[PDB]
Amino acid sequence: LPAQVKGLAAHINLSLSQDLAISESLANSYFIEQWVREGLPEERQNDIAAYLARLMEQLDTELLFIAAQHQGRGYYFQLRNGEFLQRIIQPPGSEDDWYYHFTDSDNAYELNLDSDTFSPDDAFVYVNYRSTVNAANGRPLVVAGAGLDLSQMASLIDD
């Protein structure tokens, strides 16, 4: 664990004051939790996307994501470039191993450099923040946050 790679990782952590605060409020959102408690009804996805789009106006991130527990399964949603994308989280051993590794930890949040699951040729530093509320299976009810490219992270280093 060389000193220069601790400093880079530590320096990035200290830089993201606003993205971390919003990721925590999104993961713990009462509005999002209501939607999850209702069974993730498709009819309200436009409201969820508009809620996330409002947050992205405040932030300077490439994407916002929600990973919600429903009936024992994980449902992954993402707002990116105005499009609301969704898919089901896959079993362990597949491209969604980020979700099981984070939720198995005791960390309230983590910064994860990973390839994207909708566009694998893209990569981001994801702010994975867990909700305080857990589902019946022990997984967090909601894992949510932002995806940051290098340009946005470089602007946070300056500030």
Ligand X SMILES: Nc1nc2[nH]cnc2c(=O)[nH]1
Query: Site for a second copy (CB under 8 A): which residue of 51, 65, 102, 109?
Result: 51
Question: Is position 129 an interface residue for ligand X (rule: CB under 6 A)?
Answer: no
Question: Is position 112 an interface residue for ligand X (rule: CB under 6 A)?
Answer: yes
Span from 13-21, 33-41, 53-61, 113-121 in contact with ligand X (CB under 6 A): 113-121
Residue 84 token pair: 């609301």
**From the CB of residue 119, how many other CB atoms can be counted at a distance below 10 Å?**
13
- Sign (positive/negative) of CA torsion 77, 135, 106, 130? positive
126-155 mask for a second copy (x: CB under 8 A)?
------x-----------------------
52-71 mask for ligand X (x: CB under 6 A)?
-------------x------
The residues that bridge with 125 in the sheet, in sequence order, are 113, 148
Q: Provide the minimum distance between the beta carbon of 51 and a second copy in the complex, in angstroms, as a whole number.
A: 4
Place of tokens 């980020």: 98
Q: Provide the minimum distance between the beta carbon of 110 and ligand X in the complex, in angstroms, as a whole number.
A: 8
Question: Is position 106 an interface residue for a second copy (rule: CB under 8 A)?
Answer: no
Query: Site for ligand X (CB under 6 A): which residue of 115, 119, 132, 155?
Result: 115
